[PDB]
Amino acid sequence: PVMEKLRMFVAQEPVVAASCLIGGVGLFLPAVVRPILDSLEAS
Amino acid sequence: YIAVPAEILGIILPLLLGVAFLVLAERKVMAFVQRRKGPDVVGSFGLLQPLADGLKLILKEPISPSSANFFLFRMAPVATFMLSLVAWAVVPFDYGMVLSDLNIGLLYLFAISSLGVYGIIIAGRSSNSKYAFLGALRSAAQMVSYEVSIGLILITVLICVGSCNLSEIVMAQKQIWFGIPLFPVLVMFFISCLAETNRAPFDLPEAEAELVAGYNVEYSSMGFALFFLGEYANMILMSGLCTLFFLGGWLPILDLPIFKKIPGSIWFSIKVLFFLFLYIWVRAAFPRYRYDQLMGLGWKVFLPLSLAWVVSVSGLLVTFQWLP
Amino acid sequence: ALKEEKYAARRTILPILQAEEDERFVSEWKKYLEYEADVMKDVPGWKVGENVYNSGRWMPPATGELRPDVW
Amino acid sequence: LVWLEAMLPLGIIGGMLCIMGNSQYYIHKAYHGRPKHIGHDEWDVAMERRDKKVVEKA
Amino acid sequence: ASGWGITGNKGRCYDFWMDFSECMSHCREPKDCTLLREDYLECLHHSKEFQRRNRIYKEEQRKL
Amino acid sequence: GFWTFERHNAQLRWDPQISQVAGRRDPYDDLLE
Amino acid sequence: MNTDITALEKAQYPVVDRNPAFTKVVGNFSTLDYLRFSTITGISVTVGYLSGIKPGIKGPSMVTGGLIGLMGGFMYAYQNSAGRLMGFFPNDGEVASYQKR
Amino acid sequence: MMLEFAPIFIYLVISLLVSLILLGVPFLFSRFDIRFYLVSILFLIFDLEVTFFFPWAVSLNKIDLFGFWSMMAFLFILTIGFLYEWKRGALDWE
Amino acid sequence: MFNLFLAVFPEIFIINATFILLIHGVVFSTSKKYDYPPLASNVGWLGLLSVLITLLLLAAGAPLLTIAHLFWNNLFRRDNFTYFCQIFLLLSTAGTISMCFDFFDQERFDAFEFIVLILLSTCGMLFMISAYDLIAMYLAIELQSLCFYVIAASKRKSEFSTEAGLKYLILGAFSSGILLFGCSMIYGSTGATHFDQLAKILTGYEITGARSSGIFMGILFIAVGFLFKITAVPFHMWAPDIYEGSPTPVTAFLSIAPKISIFANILRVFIYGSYGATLQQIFFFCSIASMILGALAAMAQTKVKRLLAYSSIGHVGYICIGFSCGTIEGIQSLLIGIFIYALMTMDAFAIVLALRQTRVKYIADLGALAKTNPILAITFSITMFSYAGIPPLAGFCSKFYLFFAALGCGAYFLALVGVVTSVIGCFYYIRLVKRMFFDTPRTWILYEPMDRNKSLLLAMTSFFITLFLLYPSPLFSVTHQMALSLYL
Amino acid sequence: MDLIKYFTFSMIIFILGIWGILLNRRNILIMLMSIELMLLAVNLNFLVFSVSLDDMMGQVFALLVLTVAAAESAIGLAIFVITFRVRGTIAVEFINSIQG
Amino acid sequence: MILSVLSSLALVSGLMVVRAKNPVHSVLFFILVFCDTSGLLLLLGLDFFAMIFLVVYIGAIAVLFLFVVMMFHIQIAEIHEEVLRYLPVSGIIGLIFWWEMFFILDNESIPLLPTQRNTTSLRYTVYAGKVRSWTNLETLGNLLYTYYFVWFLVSSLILLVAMIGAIVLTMHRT
Incomplete structure (x- = not known):
């Protein structure tokens, strides 16, 4: 039942969760969005 | 080069006056918050209070305790004061108003901040007091701990x-x-x-x-006095850095001819004054952390968030090709 | 864009600056060649302005200073 | 309006900062004839040295 | 030999190095590439240029 | 002449593929390109 | 970044694709590739379980061993498939789907 | 050009003179705590991280995706180390 | 882009697996729920699995390791020689790890980070073998050395382990600085650090009168660093103290794995390079000094570990004789000697680790072992006679080539030194057989039987030692293959 | 004569490291510091040579060496700390038990 | 002349590093050697390296040494020794090293003697490379993360080893 463990982790460690989300966005944009824009430009 | 020392003194002497009056301003603001007056007898509105305090310290006999490190005991305040002073050689106040237009100015500022810890540690060991030494160790550890987050924020601005x-x-x-x-x-x-x-x-x-x-x-x-002047000059410098990196430095709030009338040095001074007011307002508002609590904050909160912001800003900028 | 403007302005006026520098260096090199011809007079086997490079390709004279372009 | 007492040392600090900027700005402009250029690179240095000849030898 | 200059352009001695390398790439006797090798080393250290200029200086000092 | 062997000639084949990379160009190619 | 796949030792089998994409290599997995992958993943899970009994973490140890095995097994299968498509390994099957398609 | 460093040297000389004047005018009228070593170690590691970020941050415009991901891998290794630090109690002063 | 990284699949896998094991160990060793379980053996088994999977990935993708060689050229160079060297290194790491589980359990060494540091040093040695530039060589050497310094002081409360760590750190940092100085001198004199560029610049001239003194001293200082690394006299004195003071699994790992990695480095930096016989004279004189000092000092030893350390010093001297002669057969015999010495050393250290459960410290502690464990006493005697070089055992190949190269290269002093040192070595090796078989001590020591891992490894190594010369062709052919891959 | 003077600067730093090794039989902390001096002298040589040859390979190695120096100092001081903790002193007479 | 001044300051400071009775003083004189080295680097035109020597060697490494050596409280008796007896051996080794090693570049890099003639007009100036100048920072950053990224990552592995070793050797959790 790993859906409230994340809830407890966010409640107990808000700074760590915020850091993970911010860095995750920073990693997700070039890994996913950037190839999407590259592919769109070529066509 | 014959005119360079004139510019250097035109930087240093007003900085010392500004420090002397920042101490007065902090005493006046903390007092006004506390329903009191603060220095108001030595000179009109207490304006001669810094002169009297500095002259008092000059006339006070120096003890120089019977330690076995007399040279280091006296050199420690000189080191921290010189370091506090030298950071202003690369600070710009307006377009073209800067002593040294260093191309590596950001890293130079980081280097100065890293060097600042030595005056404090040498004072502790050279003072032949276990209490001064353990305090100096704690202060040095806190300073280096928050240098990491300062450096990572500098990297974000650099990106x-x-x-x-x-x-x-x-x-x-x-x-x-x-x-x-x-x-x-x-x-x-x-x-x-x-x-x-x-x-x-x-x-x-x-x-x-x-x-x-x-x-x-x-x-x-x-x-x-040198230790105190160094710390207050560093407060002014940190306000200036907050202004330069995040509040546009000498730039006006809006790019309109009505704002562009007043000089950029006035804009820069106003922003620095606002951050210097925050330094005092915070001193007047809150209690203090224990050493262990602030060390935990430094390593467990501010470092991870600074690293996360470096990653996020760089990733977004390279993704949409918005890099300088 | 503002920086590209500056660099473009530098690129259009580079040839005249380079031509003037080339003329100045050729005149100075003639002066040094005649100085060497005078000083190395009565030295058997000498060659005025001998290229030390076998391939014969032209290089500026070496200065003996490690980093003079930064000062 | 008693709080204006506190705005005097703050104004003094602001004026000290404005002095720190402007005093060094005007001394440099007086000695060099023109205000200091931000971003003086290898190209700007080469220009100044060549201009010296181009001016003095004319 | 790497070609990366310390100011963001081709290194000063890179062309000499390359010519040496192309020479050695097909000459079975290394003595066939001696001239290009000493050209590359002369670019590196300026030894013969400085030696000849020191000869000029020595003769000037002798005749003064 | 083991240096003649193709395994020992990697730079001679790799470097021409980066001859136009910024940081290792002759300054004049920027002027005419 | 200038890239060059040119290998030192030339392929000894017909080159079906000199630089096959990630998705193409994965889609080229044969039953032997899935057999190698499953064997490595199963052995790794088994070793994780058996080595984890004494500390009392056989479950988490199984997970860790299975992660190592999944990584290594995919790597081995991708290696084999890409090497077949580039002609470094015997690839009569890849040549069949190239002559035909 | 290193030309802008000379004013800094003169500035240092003048600041030293002022400090000596100020400090010289009045002359006329056994316990080892491992956590300090540990904080020094962590500071050294992250100081080297800031060092490797400066060339990267100014060079992002030319290294593009490859340099970004190489730095990301560097950070990943160092952050695995940092997580090891966290879990072992090196960041707790209690 | 992805396919370019097929050249580094083994290293990518092993590094990622090491990261996984680090996280697993730290997460569950600190867990209150599981009562803070020791994880040295759990992580050790998972790491042995990781090493074996890396070996499979490397062995199976033999041609793919050379893919994109132009793109990877300025970072490393993979070929046949590096391929077989890396396979040997991985096998040595796997055997060393397999010999550690009884030590983890009975001693209660609960630190899983020991395994992680071994894995990271294995990554470092992998990178050392494929290094093709002074910068890469230095960095990989330093990663290896730092891991070794940490693991040598792993028993942090022990006087011996801390002392060994300190001596190791100081002397290793000294030698590394010397080697780095050599690299800087070479770079300044030639403007190059890649091994191909160095090969071209140096070939054809050696000492032709107008000799670059910078290149000479760069070679000299780099050679001093390498000779420190291979425990060669007079840069050897760290090795006996460190070998004795470190925990016995650490000693076992240090006596085998780092020799393979640095001999690969030596062969690729100099043989592939070009200079006068000066460097060959360096290794010749160091070989002679190493044989003499190793023999005499081993004769003086009363403790098993110190005896094995000095024996290893003597054998590196025997091995370096093959490098000095500068022939294809010299390189082949060097590789054969390294292989056989590695197998024999693993045999000996499996026996030592088996006896360390009863805390074997002195040679005299082996008294009456032929009575209390007859099969074990015979296995240790087979190893000791192999060490002495007595035929038909596998150790005889090193002696044979030592004398063969000498009577061919024309050396007779070398033959005399070899004869005398071989006889001295035979004496101090058969002293151990005499202790286990001939002595009748008043007090005996009864040793706990070894675990299954060490017994299986011992059985296999004992069969190899007694029977290698009956069917030695694969080793001869593979070593000849490697020797030629260096040049052509 | 620029290059020779830079090189002799690095040379004196290296020589001072060697001398610190020679002169500090009883002071192993200064032996470590002398080794750090030797490493700085090599790092400077790479930078000076990179400038002299107009080649960037010297600077890349200079940065990587600084990383190595940092790691080696960290681990060395750790080993120093544990040795001191075990013995209660740093005197060299208490780190000589292994011999022969 | 300036090189002579910096060389003399570095020589004396290094002698003080290896000869100070108090190790704390040895660490502080080491900081002076690093500052002097930074000045030399500034003369070379490498400002990034000059600043990084301050940030890393003084700001991080020397602070580590100072923290450790201060908390040791080393008594002079445990490390003291009279060094007069080492004058001959140090004389021999230093003289050999000096003659062989301070003149190692002289044969390869023969110095240009300064003539009594303005050889500074023979400076040819190329404006093509001055149109867009790269800082030492950008030149290094162009190479670290793309063409030599493997060495970068191996250095990261070295740092990770440092962290793990520091913990496993010294940590005593409360």
Whole structure:
């Protein structure tokens, strides 16, 4: 039942969760969005 | 080069006057918050209070205790004061108003901040007092701990600008001030500056009532004065850095002819004054952390968030090809 | 864009600056060649302005200073 | 309006900062004839040295 | 030999190095590439240029 | 002449593929390109 | 970044694709590739379980061993498939789907 | 050009003179705590991280995706180390 | 882009697996729920699995390791020689790890980070073998050395382990600085650090009167660093103290794995390079000094570990004789000697680790072992006679080539030194057989039987030692293959 | 004569490291510091040579060496700390038990 | 001349590093050697390296040494020794090293003697490379993360080893 463990982790460690989300966005944009824009430009 | 020392003195002497009056301003603001007056007898509105205090310290006999490290005991306040002074050679106040237009100015500032710890540690060991030594060790550890977050925030600004030139960092904010999209980064930077300056809520050296003796307890006369002047000059410098990196430096709030009328030095001074007011307002508002609590904050909160912001800003900028 | 403007302005006026520098260096090199011809007079086997490079390709004279372009 | 007492040392600090900027700005402009250029690179240095000849030898 | 200059352009001695390398790439006797090798080393250290200029200086000092 | 062997000639084949990379160009190619 | 797949030792089998994409290599997995992958993943899970009994973490140890095995097994299968498509390994099957398609 | 460093040297000389004047005018009228070593170690590691970020941050415009991901891998290794630090109690002063 | 990284699949896998094991160990060793379980053996088994999977990935993708060689050229160079060297290194790491589980359990060494540091040093040695530039060589050497310094002081409360760590750190940092100085001198004199560029610049001239003194001293200082690394006299005195003071699994790992990695480095930096016989004279004189000092000092030893350390010093001297002669057969015999010495050393250290459960410290502790464990006493005697070089055992190949190269290269002093040192070595090796078989001590020591891992490894190594010369062709052919891959 | 003077600067730093090794039989902390001096002298040589040859390979190695120096100092001081903790002193007479 | 001044300051400071009775003083004189080295680097035109020597060697490494050596409280008796007896051996080794090693570049890099003639007009100036100048920072950053990234990552592995070793050797959790 790993859906409230994340809830407890966010409640107990808000700074760590915020850091993970911010860095995750920073990693997700070039890994996913950037190839999407590259592919769109070529066509 | 014959005119260079004139410019250097035109920087240094007004800086010393500004420090002397920042101490007065802090006493006046804390007092007004507390329904009292603060210095108001020595000179009109207490305006001669800094002169009297400095002259008092000059005339006070220097103790120089019977330690076995007399040279290092006296050199420690000179080191920290010279370091506090030398950071202003690369600070720009307006377009073209800067002594040294260093292309590596950001890294130079980081180097100065890293060097600042030595005056405090040498004062502790050279003072032949276990209490001064343990306080100096704690202060040094706190300073190096918050240097990491300061450096990571500097890297974030560098990614936005793509140049270590402070004037270029200011001129990169013509479109928008970095404090608007990087507001949490600015808050983290202001707190890291507080902790780096040993300022409330992070002022361990002022926690004498907490059984925590400061690193400068064995200092009298002008060694103590040099430590104090260094710390307050660093407060002014941190306010200036907060202004330059996030509030557009000498730039006006809006790019309109009505704002462009008043000189950029006035804009820069106003912003620095606002951050100097925050340093005092925070000192007047809150209690202080324990050493373990602030160390935990430094390593467990501000470092992870600074690293996350470096990653997020760089990833977004390379993704949409918005790099300088 | 503002920086590209500056760099473009530098690129259009480079040839005249380079031509003037080339003329100045050729005149100075003639002066040094005649100085060497005078000083190395009565030195058997000498060659005025001998290229030390076997391939014969032209290089500026070496200065003996490690980094003179940064000062 | 008693709080204006506190705005005097703050104004003094601001004026000290404005002095720190402007005093060094005007001394440099007086000695060099023109205000200091931000971003003086290898190209700007080469220009100044060549201009010295181009001016003095004319 | 790497070609990366310390100011963001081709290194000063890179062309000499390359010519040496192309020479050695097909000459089975290394003595066939001696001239290009000493050209590359002369670019590196300026030894013969400085030696000849020191000869000029020595003769000037002798005749003064 | 083991240096003649193709395994020992990697730079001779790799470097021409980066001859136009910024940081290792002759300054004049920027002027005419 | 200038890239060059040119290998030192030339392929000894017909080159079906000199630089096959990630998705193409994965889609080229044969039943032997899935057999190698499953064997490595199963052995790794088994070793994780057996080595984890004494500390009392056989479950988490199984997970860790299975992660190592999944990584290594995919790597081995991708290696084999890409090497077949580039002609470094015997690839009569890849040549069949190239002559035909 | 290193030309802008000379004013800094003169500035240092003048600041030293002022400090000596100020400090010289009045002359006329056994316990090892491992956590300090540990905080020094962590500071050294992250100081080197800031060092490797400066060339990267100014060079992002030319290294593009490859340099970004190489830095990301560097950070990943150092952050695995940092997580090891966290879990072992090196960041706790209690 | 992805396919370019097929050249580094083994290293990518092993590094990622090491990261996984680090996280697993730290997460569950600190867990209150599981009562803070020791994880040295759990992580050790998972790491042995990781090493084996890396070996499979490397062995199976033999041609793919050379893919994109132009793109990877300025970072490393993979070929046949590096391929077989890396396979040997991985096998040595796997055997060393397999010999550690009884030590983890009975001693209660609960630190899983020991395994992680071994894995990271294995990554470092992998990178050392494929290094093709002074910068890469230095960095990989330093990663290896730092891991070794940490693991040598792993028993942090022990006087011996801390002392060994300190001596190791100081002397290793000294030698590394010397080697780095050599690299800087070479770079300044030639403007190059890649091994191909160095090969071209140096070939054809050696000492032709107008000799670059910078290149000479760069070679000299780099050679001093390498000779420190291979425990060669007079840069050897660290090795006996460190070998004795480190925990016995650490000693076992240090006596085998780092020799393979640095001999690969030596062969690729100098043989592939070009200079006068000066460097060959360096290794010749160091070989002679190493044989003499190793023999005499081993004769003086009363403790098993110190005896094995000095024996290893003597054998590196025997091995370096093959490098000095500068022939294809010299390199082949060097590789054969390294292989056989590695197998024999693993045999000996499996026996030592088996006896360390009863805390074997002195040679005299082996008294009456032929009575209390007859099969074990015979296995240790087979190893000791192999060490002495007595035929038909596998150790005889090193002696044979030592004398063969000498009577061919024309050396007779070398033959005399070899004869005398061989006889001295035979004496101090058969002293151990005499202790286990001939002595009748008043007090005996009864040793706990070894675990299954060490018994299986011992059985296999004992069969190899007694029977290698009956069917030695694969080793001869593979070593000849490697020797030629260096040049052509 | 620029290059020779830079090189002799690095040379004196290296020589001072060697001398610190020679002169500090009883002071192993200064032996460590002398080794750090030798490493700085080599790092400077790479930078000076990189400038002299107009080649960037010297600077890349200079940065990587600084990383190595940092790691080696960290681990060395750790080993120093544990040795001191075990013995209670740093005197060299208490780190000589292994011999022969 | 300036090189002579910096060389003399570095020589004396290094002698003080290896000869100070108090190790704390040895660490502080080491900081002076690093500052002097930074000045030399500034003369070379490498400002990034000059600043990084301050940030890393003084700001991080020397602070580590100072923290450790201060908390040791080393008594002079445990490390003291009279060094007069080492004058001959140090004389021999230093003289050999000096003659062989301070003149190692002289044969390869023969110095240009300064003539009594303005050889500074023979400076040819190329404006093509001055149109867009790269800082030492950008030149290094162009190479670290793309063409030599493997060495970068191996250095990261070295740092990770440092962290793990520091913990496993010294940590005593409360």
